[PDB]
Amino acid sequence: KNPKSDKFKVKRFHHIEFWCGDATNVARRFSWGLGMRFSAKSDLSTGNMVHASYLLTSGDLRFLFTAPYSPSLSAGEIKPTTTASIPSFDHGSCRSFFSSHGLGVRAVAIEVEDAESAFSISVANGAIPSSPPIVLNEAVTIAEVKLYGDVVLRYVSYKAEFLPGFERVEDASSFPLDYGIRRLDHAVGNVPELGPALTYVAGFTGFHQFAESGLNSAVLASNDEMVLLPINEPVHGTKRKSQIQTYLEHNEGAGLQHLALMSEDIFRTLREMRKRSSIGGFDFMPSPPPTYYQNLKKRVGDVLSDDQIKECEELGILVDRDDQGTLLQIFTKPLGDRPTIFIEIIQRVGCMMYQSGGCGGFGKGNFSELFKSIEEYEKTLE
Amino acid sequence: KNPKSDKFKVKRFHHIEFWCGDATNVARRFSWGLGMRFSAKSDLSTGNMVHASYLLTSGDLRFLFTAPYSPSLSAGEIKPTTTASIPSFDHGSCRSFFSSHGLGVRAVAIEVEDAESAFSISVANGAIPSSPPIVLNEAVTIAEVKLYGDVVLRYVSYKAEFLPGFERVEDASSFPLDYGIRRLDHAVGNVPELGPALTYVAGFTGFHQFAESGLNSAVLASNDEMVLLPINEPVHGTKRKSQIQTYLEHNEGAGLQHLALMSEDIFRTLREMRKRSSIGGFDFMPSPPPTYYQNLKKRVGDVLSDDQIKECEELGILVDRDDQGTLLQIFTKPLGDRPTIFIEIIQRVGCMMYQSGGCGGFGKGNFSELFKSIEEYEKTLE
Numbered sequence: 001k002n003p004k005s006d007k008f009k010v011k012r013f014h015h016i017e018f019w020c021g022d023a024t025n026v027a028r029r030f031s032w033g034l035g036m037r038f039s040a041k042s043d044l045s046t047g048n049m050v051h052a053s054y055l056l057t058s059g060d061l062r063f064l065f066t067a068p069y070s071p072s073l074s075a076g077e078i079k080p081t082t083t084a085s086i087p088s089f090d091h092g093s094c095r096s097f098f099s100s101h102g103l104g105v106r107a108v109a110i111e112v113e114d115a116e117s118a119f120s121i122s123v124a125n126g127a128i129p130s131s132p133p134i135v136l137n138e139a140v141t142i143a144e145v146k147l148y149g150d151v152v153l154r155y156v157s158y159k160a161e162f163l164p165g166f167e168r169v170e171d172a173s174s175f176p177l178d179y180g181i182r183r184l185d186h187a188v189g190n191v192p193e194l195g196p197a198l199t200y201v202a203g204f205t206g207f208h209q210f211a212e213s214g215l216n217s218a219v220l221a222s223n224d225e226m227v228l229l230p231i232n233e234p235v236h237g238t239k240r241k242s243q244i245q246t247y248l249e250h251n252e253g254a255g256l257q258h259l260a261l262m263s264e265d266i267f268r269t270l271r272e273m274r275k276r277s278s279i280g281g282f283d284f285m286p287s288p289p290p291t292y293y294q295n296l297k298k299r300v301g302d303v304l305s306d307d308q309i310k311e312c313e314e315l316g317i318l319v320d321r322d323d324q325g326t327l328l329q330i331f332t333k334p335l336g337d338r339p340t341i342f343i344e345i346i347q348r349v350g351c352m353m354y355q356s357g358g359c360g361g362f363g364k365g366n367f368s369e370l371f372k373s374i375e376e377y378e379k380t381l382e
Numbered sequence: 383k384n385p386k387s388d389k390f391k392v393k394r395f396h397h398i399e400f401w402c403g404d405a406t407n408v409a410r411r412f413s414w415g416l417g418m419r420f421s422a423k424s425d426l427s428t429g430n431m432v433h434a435s436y437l438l439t440s441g442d443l444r445f446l447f448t449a450p451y452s453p454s455l456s457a458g459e460i461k462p463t464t465t466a467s468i469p470s471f472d473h474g475s476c477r478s479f480f481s482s483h484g485l486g487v488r489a490v491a492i493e494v495e496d497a498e499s500a501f502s503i504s505v506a507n508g509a510i511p512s513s514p515p516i517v518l519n520e521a522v523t524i525a526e527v528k529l530y531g532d533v534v535l536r537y538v539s540y541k542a543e544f545l546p547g548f549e550r551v552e553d554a555s556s557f558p559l560d561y562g563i564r565r566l567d568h569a570v571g572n573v574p575e576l577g578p579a580l581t582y583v584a585g586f587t588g589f590h591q592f593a594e595s596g597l598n599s600a601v602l603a604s605n606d607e608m609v610l611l612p613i614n615e616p617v618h619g620t621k622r623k624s625q626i627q628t629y630l631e632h633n634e635g636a637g638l639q640h641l642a643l644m645s646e647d648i649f650r651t652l653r654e655m656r657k658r659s660s661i662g663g664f665d666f667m668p669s670p671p672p673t674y675y676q677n678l679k680k681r682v683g684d685v686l687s688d689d690q691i692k693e694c695e696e697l698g699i700l701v702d703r704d705d706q707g708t709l710l711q712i713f714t715k716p717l718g719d720r721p722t723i724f725i726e727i728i729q730r731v732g733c734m735m736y737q738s739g740g741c742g743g744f745g746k747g748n749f750s751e752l753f754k755s756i757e758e759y760e761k762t763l764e
């Protein structure tokens with residue numbers, strides 16, 4: 001059931017902003033590891049004395065990396081005279097966020113029809129305001145409300161090129177990397193209590209609920225279900241410790257857990273990312289045992305051929321299935337020092353109408369299949 | 383003249399420690415950009431609840447990248463029960479250093495005969511103590527004194543593998559990158575006043591002075607002149623603004639300006655680094671005009687053949703010459719967000735006895751030759 005109860009007009013995921021200690025080094029690592037091009041900048045060379053911000057793109061996926069300069073460079077500015085290109089930025093907020101959480105996502109940005117109206121409706125319906133609507137060069141409007149922890153949901157609306165004050169990046173420093181990633185599929189939060197978190201977000205957006213493992217979870221979705229916001233809470237006192245609880249402890253509370261990036265060819269994406277894992281890119285979780293891939297034939301043998309199942313095994317890809325579609329997924333090890341944020345690469349098969357969002361689910365069924373698969377241990381014991 | 387006045391026995395440069403916001407992302411970027419292997423770690427997986435530290439190596443060059451975890455993970459520890467592998471580390475010091483200076487060098491570490499004796503003699507001769515001698519597993523001793531700004535000179539001595547508590551890195555995550563870099567040649571500080579800085583450091587080490595451009599500089603050297611510590615001060619009120627003064631402003635005061643890394647084949651190093659500049663590695667300063675390389679024949683045509691001079695032009699390499707040797711050098715753009723720290727790649731020709739340290743100088747003569755070379759403008763004007 002989709003009651004289409006969005007309280008304002010939501011278009012698509014727009015960008016994700018990481019708050020960094022040094023934006024240059026994180027952006028360069030992510031660019032090489034994920035195959036994202038340098039496409040825009042706002043920094044000292046563009047007249048920004050407040051923060052350094054670098055934009056990477058791959059298809060419609062936009063990753064923004066921002067770090068503060070010395071407050072001394074902008075000591076004489078006030079908000080009416082600021083050189084910052086992102087008006088919500090604050091030196092103290094950014095340093096406090098990073099000191100408290102380490103490297104991670106500050107902003108989940110969605111494009112809306114009217115960011116001022118989205119902000120107003122959201123706050124009227126319970127959203128805690130974070131940054132009021134600011135109109136940039138009479139062209140772009142940006143506003144922010146609190147989502148969970150110190151993560152904000154950022155609204156952006158365009159009258160008619162990322163943000164004013166950003167410059168397109170010099171061709172020489174913009175190598176056209178591309179490993180196949182095309183857009184953000186979903187963005188997932190970890191919280192101590194799922195119930196109140198869902199009630200708060202669903203309350204102010206009108207997003208509806210989208211149709212033993214250490215977690216309980218639920219997914220909020222926009223009218224066309226292309227903006228997907230799962231939220232997890234821990235399940236305490238199990239056999240092994242909950243990964244959600246470990247996250248909360250190492251992150252100092254709620255925050256963004258993972259970003260799921262849709263690829264238009266997950267085989268190529270994973271080949272390219274895995275070649276770079278040990279030369280500056282990203283590491284992947286340990287692959288499932290061969291029994292997992294033998295079990296794939298019975299589960300998805302009508303969707304994937306033997307060779308494609310063999311290719312999944314070569315690359316460590318997980319496979320799950322809905323009553324409507326199929327999901328190919330894999331998870332990176334944490335992106336930084338702390339066992340907190342990580343990335344999921346995904347590709348979805350089915351639900352052709354365009355492909356409907358969330359086709360195939362989120363891989364909940366792979367918790368059971370992975371554990372059952374560990375029966376490779378019992379088979380090796382023989 | 384070398385009066386060999388070292389007040390304790392100094393061996394060689396041992397390592398350089400960067401204080402980071404996220405050690406993982408900086409270390410991975412540097413590894414790919416410079417061709418340095420992951421060789422040791424101290425982090426949550428080794429039982430360190432205090433800091434994440436990752437060691438990169440290339441030949442005898444050792445770069446250490448350290449960042450603090452949440453203080454909450456180690457809240458119950460005291461120094462007698464710490465899980466930190468580097469006893470001088472402090473969460474508050476590290477966060478304050480990074481918030482104030484951005485990414486940069488915290489420690490210039492030299493190997494000595496006896497770090498406890500080196501520390502004692504140094505402080506008796508005016509050194510401001512930073513961290514007292516600590517003996518690790520009855521095997522390694524480490525002590526620190528203030529060098530300039532918030533940079534420390536760290537002494538390490540070995541009874542007889544980086545530091546106890548560090549684990550050698552798994553072969554799988556240790557790709558054997560190597561672009562030819564072999565050791566640290568010199569480490570350079572920027573300070574507001576050169577005179578007092580030299581007097582302070584030379585006072586407590588006994589290091590001797592080693593034999594219009596916006597700076598005054600001088601070089602302190604150990605007995606065998608293999609530990610080389612240049613220091614710069616700005617020269618105010620010129621035509622263009624002093625790069626030393628820009629550094630001090632953006633760094634919030636004195637700090638490490640550049641690290642000069644000796645290559646055993648600067649042509650190969652620069653080929654490899656330049657191929658990676660726009661896919662996650664390091665950028666280089668703009669190359670000198672062709673007139674610079676035409677002028678090379680008269681200056682060094684007895685040392686470098688035409689083809690080798692052409693290879694320098696292809697790679698943007700600078701060349702200077704002493705009365706004793708020749709220097710090939712090139713400079714990266716700043717390593718992080720701020721126009722502060724950068725890297726020099728160098729290779730020295732001559733002074734064969736082994737090669738004596740500092741053979742060929744530090745390239746002071748290239749300030750004049752670069753400006754004179756800008757006569758390409760007058761030639762193009764014709």
Ligand SMILES: Cc1c(C(=O)C2=C(O)CCCC2=O)ccc2c1c(=O)n(CC#C[Si](C)(C)C)c(=O)n2C
Pocket residue numbers: 186188217218230231232243258260285318331344362363364366367370
């Ligand atoms: C993160 C994730 C998802 C997922 O994407 C998802 C959502 O999008 C919304 C719903 C809830 C949720 O979880 C799905 C499957 C996963 C993982 C994952 O992270 N891992 C890694 C480990 C482990 Si361990 C060693 C602590 C037992 C998996 O194995 N599977 C199988």
Ligand SMILES: Cc1c(C(=O)C2=C(O)CCCC2=O)ccc2c1c(=O)n(CC#C[Si](C)(C)C)c(=O)n2C
Pocket residue numbers: 568570599600612613614625640642667700713726744745746748749752
């Ligand atoms: C850093 C450096 C050195 C150097 O290593 C050195 C020492 O080791 C100890 C002594 C003092 C010192 O300087 C030498 C030459 C250099 C540079 C440099 O940084 N640059 C870059 C710019 C510039 Si601009 C656009 C602001 C005029 C050079 O061009 N040359 C030519």
Ligand SMILES: [Co+2]
Pocket residue numbers: 186188258260344362
């Ligand atoms: Co997911």
Ligand SMILES: [Co+2]
Pocket residue numbers: 568570640642726744
């Ligand atoms: Co130098």
